[PDB]
Amino acid sequence: SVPGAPNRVSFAKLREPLEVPGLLDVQTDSFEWLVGSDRWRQAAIDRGEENPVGGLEEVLAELSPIEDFSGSMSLSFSDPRFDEVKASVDECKDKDMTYAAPLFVTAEFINNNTGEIKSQTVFMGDFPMMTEKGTFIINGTERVVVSQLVRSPGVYFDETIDKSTEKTLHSVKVIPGRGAWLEFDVDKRDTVGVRIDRKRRQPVTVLLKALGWTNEQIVERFGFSEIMMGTLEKDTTSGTDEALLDIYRKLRPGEPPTKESAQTLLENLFFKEKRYDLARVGRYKVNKKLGLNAGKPITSSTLTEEDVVATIEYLVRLHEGQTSMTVPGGVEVPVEVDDIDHFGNRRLRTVGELIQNQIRVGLSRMERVVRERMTTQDVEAITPQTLINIRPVVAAIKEFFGTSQLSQFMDQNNPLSGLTHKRRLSALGPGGLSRERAGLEVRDVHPSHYGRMCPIETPEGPNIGLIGSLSVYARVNPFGFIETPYRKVENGVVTDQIDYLTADEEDRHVVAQANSPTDENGRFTEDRVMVRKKGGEVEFVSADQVDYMDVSPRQMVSVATAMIPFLEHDDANRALMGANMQRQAVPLVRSEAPLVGTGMELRAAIDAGDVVVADKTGVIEEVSADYITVMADDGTRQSYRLRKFARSNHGTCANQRPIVDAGQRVEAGQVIADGPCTQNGEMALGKNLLVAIMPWEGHNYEDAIILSNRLVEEDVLTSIHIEEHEIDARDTKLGAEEITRDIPNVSDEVLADLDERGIVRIGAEVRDGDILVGKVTPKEVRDTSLKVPHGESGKVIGIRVFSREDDDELPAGVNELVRVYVAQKRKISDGDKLAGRHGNKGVIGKILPVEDMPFLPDGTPVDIILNTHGVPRRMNIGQILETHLGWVAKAGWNIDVAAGVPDWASKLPEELYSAPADSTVATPVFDGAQEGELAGLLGSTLPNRDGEVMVDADGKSTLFDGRSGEPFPYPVTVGYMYILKLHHLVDDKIHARSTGPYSMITQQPLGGKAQFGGQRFGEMECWAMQAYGAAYTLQELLTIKSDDTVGRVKVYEAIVKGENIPEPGIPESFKVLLKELQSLCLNVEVLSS
Amino acid sequence: LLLDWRAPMARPFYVATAANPENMRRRRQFHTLGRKVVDFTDEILGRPTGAEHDATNDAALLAADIVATIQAEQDQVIRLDHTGVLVIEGGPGTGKTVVALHRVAYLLYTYRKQMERHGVLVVGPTPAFLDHIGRVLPSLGESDAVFMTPGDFVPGLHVTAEDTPEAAEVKGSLKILDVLKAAVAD
Amino acid sequence: ADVLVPPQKQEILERHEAEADAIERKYQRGALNHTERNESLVKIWQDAT
Amino acid sequence: LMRRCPRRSFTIVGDLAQRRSPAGARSWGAMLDSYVPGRWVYKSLSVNY
């Protein structure tokens, strides 16, 4: 679909009926719903939704009206309006501003005592806006609000084994959007009890009577089960008033009751909308279950007596072991337990909904203050502006984007990292779950995840299973349930109609696999088909027993997983490792698209938003390293600013380079500038290297990697890293901090680079301890200059200075602020971690000279050597498949079709019959190059410059030993593999300490590389030292090196003075204990024996 | 070669009766003390003839239409889907024990899933009913069933002495409940 | 070339598949419980592996 | 027993005319109506063979 994409021949044999949707639509559509954008309104009104209502409109309608006790005063809100954004994205990121737009709402005040109306526009604050990239710019930084998985409101039934009697017991809980919980259960003694708002358990009949039920009505509705009759006959309460009084006592202990509040307490607690509601999603769920309020649309959001009675009846029927239940007048429904892990129950709070909830809290605070201050002002002159307090709402919005877990720094390590961050599904966070809740259980892969959450992607750290990634084809319901598309199938012929099914909908049908052999019109050729059944059970069924089919084999995978070639040949563990490692590859100075890859790099790169795409068709007018000018055919002129050597949140380079020249004609949507990790508009996370699979002198033992010096000489794996150093000058109790070129008691040479302001000049080389900006402070002055930390160096590439004298919005107390950016080129070196896309990872153990590497018969040295022993035992043989195909891509192929096409090539599309050298190919994850096709292509490779083929049909070549010169006795597998430079460089993992700062809380050495701390000497290390019998070393570690200050300094002086280290003894912490013992009149004495 | 008693085709062995034979003509029970069959006893699901050998002699006694009405009544008692308090009464020589055993077997089989955890209590002067349950439902009789005499209701305690025929009567009536309260009030 | 596939892998499987079919057949007639049917299938496929 | 079986699922077998204890039942209704009025089902066997 991309007008100007590079050609990449594909091995796919299936035809896609549906193209991948906007990958980051989950963010943009949600936010457009929040602000009620015109696009969202048009999209929603076309779906069938009548009179769409936005998030802001929803919360404002919920808020209004605001009225007093007498109902004389009223205040209403309407028409939320957004003005133009205050500053551009670039300016927002330059001046540490927030990308926000003013918000205006019309507030109308009504005074029934006179009937006069007063409408007025009220400024509600600067609402932060979402960029087209799906990010929020707060205080100059880029942030992503991750979607949150939460158990949707509804009614949930479960059965658990009693830990006392081992008995199975049934329970149900009603989970509302807001308000008191309501739980029912059957205990180990077959007594039905109810817990209202998590209080003490009491018989359910008490609540039934509290709702106005009489004994006759209870015995009529119930009585099908003897346990309910037993509970009723064994209840010491009779009458609605009696039950209401008992509930009052068990909810509000001690305080006097009254008939006035007896009914009111329950009515407010569960039935009045201003205190309890099911949020229009709990209402829908509770209607679908229990068969209540069927047919007619959702009209009210609150609970009803019918819901409570139906829940009780359902619980009792489930306990009795029944499977079908029918409420009087309702639709018959199944009786079953509810799986809380099923995406039919778990829903997704999108960014818009989280922001809406925070706005709701702020509006509640505003409602409280308005309710307070209407009484304290003259009703004959009050206006909407005097009543309104906008400090709480703006405070709530400002706090959500600050100290909140869901709003997180954007993962700007590379474009794919940010793209996967936006499509992240986080189960934790406010309201998600806590440390005390499910561990092993909630982290499992559930059958309902298919096509909705990727089963492979998950962060390596403590959040395995708790954080997932949205599938490529999935989308969110208005209720927040994740749908996925399927093709209709009728009479055994696959139909072209596509339906977005939710997990609950999907469980009711039979779905066939994407790779179903079908005729031209879609009729299944096989009499039997592989399908997924209701309970996630895979089965083989008749071709006429299928209702739906997967749109594509990529249905179940996400972007990074979809970017792994030959994924089906790799075990799930290594696939997960490769998917996660793709997310942390550092951009290189030169980008290079994979020689062998998937058909996903281009779309992922374009959707990530780090490539500049022409807004509309036009002719390139002027191209520079900084900006691109396009003269559109419509007459308008566009100018795109390019980011050059900009620092990412993680410290990587975000340089953008144009890929067009003046006078070129560009179609709308065409890529005109590449991002950090793209070549011509597609992912270029790594480099294609010539690899030989063999053990080599033990330098690649235990997953170590051997690199050719070419990768250092030609800057193949070189990267640019930018670090930021910040320093502020403030007020004090003794004066203020001053910045100047003058620093006391320092040499003239250490401040040579400093300019008139005392700031290091741009382009200056700075290393460990060099002064960046000189700052002098009151204790006759004291030096407090900023300096380069230990082991850091680079070139000064930028300075940003903010001052209070220039009306810069620095925080209170700060008078000035300076940021200095230092850039460094890092070559590839021993200890840096390299990895492929198949989970094969290792640190560089040796970088051999060019003439030491094994070299091909034509003299070409291999770039990397990988050990043979790593592959077979890890079931990541896909890395081998790639290695072969990567060769066939580097050297073109030509299938001989003289006497007809060969049998192995009968499936290859004709476009794959031949290709030139340095060609790029695409092999989708579950539909691509087959083993036989690849085997034939290996034998169909073109000759080299000299007219001979080096890699034979087996994929192996004879390699000469660069050191001894003799040919290796056996042929070795040689190919081209795409490898990544991961962000785990040894340059920022080496840490050492002889002496340094100490924690004043315990006097022990600090902990951390940035704190110049020491290594942990754990208790198990103490055990290991004890087993050696090394008493002296253990004592030295425990006493001198950690705790003893006097011994510490004594040993330091002894070492620097060249005398044998003294004997530790009589520890201070032992002297304190001895003196405490003496304080208790205990004559503690040390005996010489 | 052998069917698990929970298998669907083994359902008749528990539910079939002479009035509603689920396509079976004879049901044979083996009494086993280990890896050995001590003896077997057969019941015809239909009109008997007397040549069959059963320790209960039901086939011979019934071989010695009124027999059709006997079968109908026994089936009515056995198959009753009451899931409640069923009181079976019969004069001596009518075979209330056999019908009760078949009824309890049917009830326990049809509701095994609903009562696999709660357990079954047996009360009477002899464990014969528990013997039958164990010989037809060992998975339930061995580990789930419980037996108690009226003097063994209290755990730990095991009484066998019986009181005089007047103190027992007052002590055996709810009229004494008011006394007990008074006692703790005393 | 060196990751060899035994030629007797297509036969073995189909043979055992037949047995699996038989098990399902006996399950359709009610001679097998669901859990016991799964146990029998697991044993058969372990033998096949 | 009724305290020990809230489900009220009972299989009660006996014959009133064969009672020997003084506290024994004289009518099933007098014993059961306190707990399951009318809900308990009575079946009586008629033929002596």
Side-chain angles (χ1 to χ4, degrees):
Chain A
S1 174
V2 189
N7 196 35
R8 184 182 282 270
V9 303
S10 188
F11 279 89
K13 290 152 186 67
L14 304 183
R15 204 211 41 91
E16 293 221 329
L18 184 75
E19 205 194 340
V20 186
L23 287 169
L24 72 173
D25 273 348
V26 60
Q27 299 288 96
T28 56
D29 301 3
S30 178
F31 193 80
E32 293 179 353
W33 161 85
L34 173 59
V35 305
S37 295
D38 298 347
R39 184 176 176 87
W40 158 85
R41 200 176 301 272
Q42 293 324 120
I45 190 167
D46 299 341
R47 287 196 292 272
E49 180 57 60
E50 63 272 43
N51 309 108
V53 64
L56 290 202
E57 280 273 27
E58 187 191 271
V59 287
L60 287 170
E62 191 186 20
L63 172 68
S64 58
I66 313 177
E67 293 179 353
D68 63 358
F69 296 132
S70 77
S72 61
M73 311 175 88
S74 192
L75 180 65
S76 287
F77 303 85
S78 63
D79 191 22
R81 264 161 301 111
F82 289 101
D83 204 285
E84 286 285 5
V85 176
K86 302 195 307 181
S88 66
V89 165
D90 291 331
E91 191 176 340
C92 289
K93 286 192 278 191
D94 291 338
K95 290 182 178 173
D96 303 0
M97 291 175 328
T98 288
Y99 181 75
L103 168 59
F104 296 98
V105 75
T106 194
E108 304 206 339
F109 170 44
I110 281 284
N111 183 25
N112 285 323
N113 296 125
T114 182
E116 204 263 348
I117 184 161
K118 284 183 91 83
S119 163
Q120 189 59 254
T121 285
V122 171
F123 163 65
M124 281 285 198
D126 285 350
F127 204 76
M129 304 304 288
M130 179 185 285
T131 66
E132 292 198 329
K133 311 298 172 68
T135 61
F136 297 86
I137 287 158
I138 311 298
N139 280 17
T141 61
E142 199 148 21
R143 287 186 152 250
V144 167
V145 177
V146 305
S147 290
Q148 189 192 46
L149 280 168
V150 285
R151 175 164 52 177
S152 64
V155 60
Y156 295 106
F157 297 77
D158 75 338
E159 82 176 89
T160 64
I161 302 305
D162 176 23
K163 303 305 185 297
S164 181
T165 62
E166 182 65 26
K167 281 187 169 206
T168 184
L169 294 174
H170 295 264
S171 180
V172 54
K173 57 186 70 179
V174 184
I175 306 289
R178 294 179 293 103
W181 272 19
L182 183 57
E183 308 186 52
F184 308 86
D185 56 49
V186 189
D187 60 22
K188 64 183 184 177
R189 299 206 75 234
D190 313 297
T191 302
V192 192
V194 65
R195 295 168 223 246
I196 291 166
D197 213 18
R198 303 190 169 198
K199 311 321 298 204
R200 172 171 168 71
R201 188 185 188 254
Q202 65 209 263
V204 69
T205 52
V206 174
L207 176 55
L208 281 168
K209 289 161 181 170
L211 290 157
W213 282 61
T214 64
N215 284 27
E216 281 216 90
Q217 296 181 20
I218 298 179
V219 65
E220 195 277 309
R221 177 59 178 270
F222 305 103
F224 67 89
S225 67
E226 261 295 350
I227 67 173
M228 281 286 318
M229 301 295 78
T231 304
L232 178 64
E233 290 296 323
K234 211 184 305 185
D235 176 18
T236 62
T237 291
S238 62
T240 300
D241 51 356
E242 194 83 340
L244 291 203
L245 271 293
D246 206 54
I247 295 167
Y248 181 87
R249 289 175 174 183
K250 214 162 301 183
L251 276 295
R252 295 166 174 79
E255 277 81 62
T258 185
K259 176 260 292 186
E260 181 64 27
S261 184
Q263 291 85 227
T264 305
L265 63 91
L266 199 76
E267 209 67 31
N268 294 359
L269 191 73
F270 288 122
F271 301 112
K272 194 152 41 53
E273 272 176 50
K274 71 206 303 173
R275 188 180 200 110
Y276 185 106
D277 69 345
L278 302 174
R280 171 58 164 270
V281 64
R283 187 67 261 175
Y284 154 74
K285 288 284 289 182
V286 172
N287 288 6
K288 199 162 67 65
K289 209 168 179 84
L290 312 176
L292 291 201
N293 301 350
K296 65 188 289 293
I298 295 93
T299 296
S300 306
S301 63
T302 190
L303 197 68
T304 71
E305 174 183 341
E306 186 174 23
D307 300 306
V308 171
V309 179
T311 303
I312 293 160
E313 183 178 1
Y314 196 105
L315 169 69
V316 176
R317 299 261 186 192
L318 176 62
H319 186 87
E320 271 286 80
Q322 310 190 26
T323 291
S324 296
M325 187 213 67
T326 178
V327 179
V331 295
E332 182 169 296
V333 293
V335 176
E336 58 178 326
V337 175
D338 301 309
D339 186 354
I340 65 169
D341 301 343
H342 201 292
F343 291 169
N345 300 322
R346 304 185 79 193
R347 72 178 286 271
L348 198 64
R349 287 164 166 186
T350 57
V351 57
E353 181 172 341
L354 295 164
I355 298 160
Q356 194 211 42
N357 290 345
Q358 295 299 118
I359 297 169
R360 163 179 290 107
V361 170
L363 290 181
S364 292
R365 283 197 272 266
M366 191 185 76
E367 183 178 1
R368 184 71 201 300
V369 64
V370 163
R371 294 271 200 61
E372 281 186 280
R373 75 159 67 164
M374 293 182 286
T375 67
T376 310
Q377 298 190 351
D378 55 344
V379 181
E380 61 192 335
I382 287 162
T383 62
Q385 272 143 350
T386 74
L387 296 176
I388 290 286
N389 190 5
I390 62 162
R391 280 82 66 192
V393 65
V394 303
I397 288 297
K398 204 182 81 93
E399 183 163 48
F400 172 71
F401 285 106
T403 44
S404 182
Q405 197 282 346
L406 291 153
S407 185
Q408 302 161 5
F409 292 166
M410 201 205 188
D411 274 318
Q412 296 189 338
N413 192 356
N414 65 63
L416 177 67
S417 75
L419 174 58
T420 52
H421 197 183
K422 290 161 194 176
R423 310 183 89 247
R424 190 179 300 307
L425 308 174
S426 186
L428 53 81
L433 57 85
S434 61
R435 177 54 180 79
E436 274 186 333
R437 290 168 67 160
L440 183 75
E441 322 302 359
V442 66
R443 298 172 189 259
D444 287 326
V445 177
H446 199 275
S448 68
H449 296 355
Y450 188 95
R452 299 176 178 82
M453 179 187 272
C454 181
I456 294 157
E457 288 186 356
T458 185
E460 292 292 69
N463 303 315
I464 298 194
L466 301 185
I467 296 174
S469 179
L470 189 71
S471 298
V472 290
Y473 280 103
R475 69 171 199 195
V476 305
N477 261 338
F479 300 140
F481 306 110
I482 301 168
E483 307 179 308
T484 186
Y486 296 106
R487 295 175 79 166
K488 271 189 166 88
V489 175
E490 54 206 10
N491 305 326
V493 59
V494 181
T495 301
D496 311 320
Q497 213 54 20
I498 287 174
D499 294 308
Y500 273 80
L501 298 184
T502 300
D504 284 329
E505 284 185 80
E506 181 174 14
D507 291 331
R508 304 188 51 274
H509 312 160
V510 176
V511 191
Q513 209 186 67
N515 280 288
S516 290
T518 55
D519 292 328
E520 296 81 1
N521 206 283
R523 174 91 51 191
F524 293 91
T525 71
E526 270 178 330
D527 63 318
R528 211 170 174 190
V529 176
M530 211 195 178
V531 302
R532 291 177 286 108
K533 287 292 199 72
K534 168 159 188 290
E537 182 158 23
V538 178
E539 187 55 275
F540 281 68
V541 305
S542 65
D544 296 89
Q545 193 185 358
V546 297
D547 203 338
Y548 280 101
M549 201 195 108
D550 291 331
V551 290
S552 71
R554 272 72 75 185
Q555 183 97 328
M556 60 164 267
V557 290
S558 52
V559 181
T561 315
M563 261 165 78
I564 298 174
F566 299 115
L567 174 73
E568 47 197 354
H569 304 84
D570 301 326
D571 196 14
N573 290 318
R574 290 275 141 170
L576 180 158
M577 286 195 213
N580 296 32
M581 291 185 308
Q582 280 181 103
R583 211 180 54 238
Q584 54 181 334
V586 306
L588 304 176
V589 182
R590 283 221 191 300
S591 284
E592 177 180 291
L595 205 54
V596 65
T598 298
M600 194 78 226
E601 281 87 6
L602 169 75
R603 266 306 295 289
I606 288 167
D607 282 20
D610 291 331
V611 295
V612 185
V613 298
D615 291 331
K616 46 193 75 181
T617 304
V619 164
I620 304 304
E621 193 196 70
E622 176 164 308
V623 183
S624 174
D626 303 297
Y627 62 75
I628 300 164
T629 318
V630 184
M631 190 86 257
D633 296 345
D634 274 29
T636 304
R637 185 181 276 102
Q638 294 79 45
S639 308
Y640 309 100
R641 174 61 31 61
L642 304 179
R643 289 168 60 75
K644 307 297 284 163
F645 303 99
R647 178 171 186 277
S648 307
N649 286 337
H650 295 181
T652 52
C653 182
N655 181 38
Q656 289 182 313
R657 59 184 288 275
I659 59 169
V660 293
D661 63 28
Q664 179 169 353
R665 194 161 191 310
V666 296
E667 189 83 38
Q670 169 169 346
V671 169
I672 61 176
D674 285 331
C677 291
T678 70
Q679 184 178 2
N680 305 339
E682 53 183 354
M683 294 296 172
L685 301 178
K687 288 280 190 154
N688 302 285
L689 298 202
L690 177 59
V691 62
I693 311 299
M694 66 188 304
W696 197 92
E697 304 293 338
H699 283 100
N700 56 356
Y701 166 88
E702 292 292 329
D703 304 306
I705 295 171
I706 298 159
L707 290 194
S708 178
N709 205 54
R710 183 187 81 91
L711 313 180
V712 177
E713 289 181 23
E714 321 295 9
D715 273 8
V716 178
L717 296 169
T718 301
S719 52
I720 293 163
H721 297 268
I722 307 173
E723 51 166 330
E724 168 190 326
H725 302 267
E726 196 160 330
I727 195 70
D728 68 355
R730 299 150 316 130
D731 296 344
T732 76
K733 280 298 311 302
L734 169 62
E737 293 83 3
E738 170 72 9
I739 286 167
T740 300
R741 181 142 84 85
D742 294 333
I743 303 95
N745 295 53
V746 288
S747 186
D748 176 31
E749 65 183 1
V750 304
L751 54 85
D753 296 306
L754 275 51
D755 69 1
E756 293 90 0
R757 285 182 320 262
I759 302 176
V760 65
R761 288 166 186 277
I762 285 168
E765 265 178 25
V766 302
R767 63 150 307 170
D768 185 341
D770 289 6
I771 298 171
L772 290 178
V773 65
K775 194 180 65 164
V776 297
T777 60
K779 267 303 193 184
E780 168 58 24
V781 288
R782 171 172 165 242
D783 49 304
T784 60
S785 308
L786 180 69
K787 305 201 200 82
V788 181
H790 198 318
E792 294 169 35
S793 61
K795 290 194 180 185
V796 179
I797 64 158
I799 302 155
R800 304 201 61 51
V801 56
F802 317 82
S803 65
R804 197 72 74 159
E805 185 90 41
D806 298 70
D807 276 300
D808 298 326
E809 61 271 14
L810 289 72
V814 181
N815 187 304
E816 201 195 310
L817 182 63
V818 180
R819 292 191 187 112
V820 184
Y821 292 90
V822 177
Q824 180 151 53
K825 294 223 261 183
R826 289 187 176 174
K827 302 289 181 67
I828 199 72
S829 71
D830 291 331
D832 296 325
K833 196 191 285 167
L834 261 53
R837 293 172 287 181
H838 317 276
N840 48 310
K841 72 199 210 285
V843 292
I844 299 153
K846 192 70 189 277
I847 304 191
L848 294 176
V850 178
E851 75 280 1
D852 266 21
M853 302 295 290
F855 69 90
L856 285 160
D858 63 358
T860 300
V862 309
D863 287 322
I864 178 169
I865 315 173
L866 296 182
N867 199 331
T868 309
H869 299 84
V871 187
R873 52 165 164 155
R874 284 164 181 154
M875 261 55 68
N876 65 6
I877 200 71
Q879 79 180 79
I880 298 300
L881 280 78
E882 186 208 346
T883 299
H884 287 182
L885 188 56
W887 176 262
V888 169
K890 188 76 169 174
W893 69 91
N894 190 291
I895 303 184
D896 188 15
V897 176
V901 300
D903 185 21
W904 62 266
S906 51
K907 307 308 186 331
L908 288 174
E910 291 83 3
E911 311 97 350
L912 289 179
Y913 284 6
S914 67
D918 293 86
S919 171
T920 48
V921 302
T923 187
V925 288
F926 291 103
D927 167 33
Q930 300 304 285
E931 55 208 290
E933 299 172 330
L934 197 169
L937 289 168
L938 276 160
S940 306
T941 293
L942 295 173
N944 75 308
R945 173 174 66 169
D946 293 336
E948 61 177 322
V949 296
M950 311 296 207
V951 168
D952 60 32
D954 295 346
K956 303 181 182 173
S957 180
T958 298
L959 290 176
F960 284 105
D961 183 357
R963 287 184 163 186
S964 68
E966 308 295 330
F968 285 112
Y970 308 84
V972 176
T973 296
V974 177
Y976 280 81
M977 200 201 295
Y978 200 65
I979 64 166
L980 315 170
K981 184 181 183 181
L982 302 188
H983 187 193
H984 285 271
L985 298 94
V986 73
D987 293 338
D988 46 54
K989 286 189 183 287
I990 187 174
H991 181 222
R993 167 190 172 110
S994 50
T995 311
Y998 299 92
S999 58
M1000 293 324 305
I1001 296 89
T1002 176
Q1003 199 43 229
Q1004 291 173 11
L1006 295 177
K1009 184 174 185 289
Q1011 284 215 304
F1012 212 86
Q1015 299 313 307
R1016 189 86 75 160
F1017 182 69
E1019 179 63 23
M1020 301 176 108
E1021 281 86 40
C1022 297
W1023 297 350
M1025 301 295 288
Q1026 287 162 22
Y1028 274 110
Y1032 278 85
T1033 307
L1034 177 60
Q1035 184 184 5
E1036 192 156 328
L1037 274 152
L1038 289 174
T1039 58
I1040 303 303
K1041 285 164 167 166
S1042 179
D1043 284 337
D1044 286 331
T1045 300
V1046 298
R1048 170 195 305 165
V1049 299
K1050 273 214 299 300
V1051 165
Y1052 178 88
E1053 301 216 90
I1055 295 166
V1056 301
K1057 274 142 191 63
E1059 65 183 1
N1060 59 7
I1061 298 184
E1063 175 196 323
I1066 318 302
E1068 306 180 48
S1069 73
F1070 181 58
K1071 293 197 300 177
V1072 55
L1073 161 63
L1074 207 76
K1075 284 288 163 195
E1076 285 169 355
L1077 289 165
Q1078 289 197 324
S1079 304
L1080 278 296
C1081 301
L1082 301 178
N1083 170 49
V1084 65
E1085 78 200 24
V1086 179
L1087 293 161
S1088 303
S1089 180
Chain B
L1 307 185
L2 185 71
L3 293 185
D4 181 276
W5 67 274
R6 303 195 286 284
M9 311 165 38
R11 195 176 162 278
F13 184 76
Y14 297 93
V15 303
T17 69
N20 278 61
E22 321 286 20
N23 194 57
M24 322 285 188
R25 48 182 296 251
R26 177 172 313 96
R27 169 163 65 213
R28 170 171 296 177
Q29 300 192 350
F30 303 127
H31 300 161
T32 59
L33 186 48
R35 290 195 155 207
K36 44 202 161 53
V37 302
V38 179
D39 63 31
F40 80 80
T41 67
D42 291 331
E43 64 172 314
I44 297 158
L45 280 77
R47 281 129 164 65
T49 66
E52 181 269 324
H53 188 147
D54 71 305
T56 60
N57 313 301
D58 64 358
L61 294 166
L62 286 164
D65 178 5
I66 187 156
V67 178
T69 61
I70 295 167
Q71 304 323 312
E73 193 174 61
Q74 294 184 352
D75 188 358
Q76 187 58 255
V77 183
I78 289 160
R79 286 289 191 91
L80 184 70
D81 55 337
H82 181 217
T83 187
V85 178
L86 168 62
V87 174
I88 314 171
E89 197 175 329
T94 297
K96 63 172 168 64
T97 49
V98 177
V99 181
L101 289 178
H102 291 181
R103 167 54 185 181
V104 66
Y106 166 90
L107 190 159
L108 297 175
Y109 179 85
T110 48
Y111 292 100
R112 64 193 179 280
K113 172 59 175 67
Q114 282 46 50
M115 291 163 29
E116 58 97 15
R117 199 56 44 89
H118 292 287
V120 183
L121 169 62
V122 184
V123 184
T126 185
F129 264 51
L130 184 63
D131 188 316
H132 187 266
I133 292 171
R135 288 195 312 206
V136 297
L137 289 158
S139 307
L140 192 141
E142 290 179 342
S143 62
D144 291 331
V146 166
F147 176 83
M148 290 197 229
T149 63
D152 203 328
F153 289 146
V154 171
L157 175 65
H158 181 73
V159 182
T160 292
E162 304 182 13
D163 213 358
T164 185
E166 184 156 51
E169 193 189 328
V170 62
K171 293 162 72 179
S173 71
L174 276 72
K175 292 293 190 284
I176 206 170
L177 194 61
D178 305 342
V179 178
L180 290 178
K181 291 177 177 183
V184 305
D186 181 65
Chain C
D2 66 45
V3 188
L4 301 169
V5 162
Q8 286 103 16
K9 182 217 160 183
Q10 193 54 340
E11 183 268 328
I12 288 162
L13 290 176
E14 65 182 1
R15 210 198 319 130
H16 285 82
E17 191 81 70
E19 311 209 296
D21 191 11
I23 300 298
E24 301 276 350
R25 192 181 302 143
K26 300 300 177 187
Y27 167 78
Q28 289 297 326
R29 294 179 66 188
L32 294 174
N33 296 115
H34 190 256
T35 51
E36 181 206 340
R37 182 210 75 143
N38 287 20
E39 286 169 354
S40 302
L41 293 173
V42 166
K43 283 192 285 167
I44 287 152
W45 289 123
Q46 280 170 351
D47 189 320
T49 309
Chain D
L1 291 180
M2 292 285 187
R3 175 167 51 245
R4 292 186 183 201
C5 189
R7 267 168 52 80
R8 304 288 181 262
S9 190
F10 282 70
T11 305
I12 300 178
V13 179
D15 179 22
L16 296 172
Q18 287 182 73
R19 173 181 55 81
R20 65 184 294 275
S21 72
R26 287 156 182 77
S27 172
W28 303 113
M31 291 292 185
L32 295 172
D33 270 328
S34 304
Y35 301 112
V36 286
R39 281 173 268 145
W40 65 279
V41 172
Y42 181 66
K43 296 296 180 192
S44 190
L45 291 73
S46 306
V47 181
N48 174 290
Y49 60 108

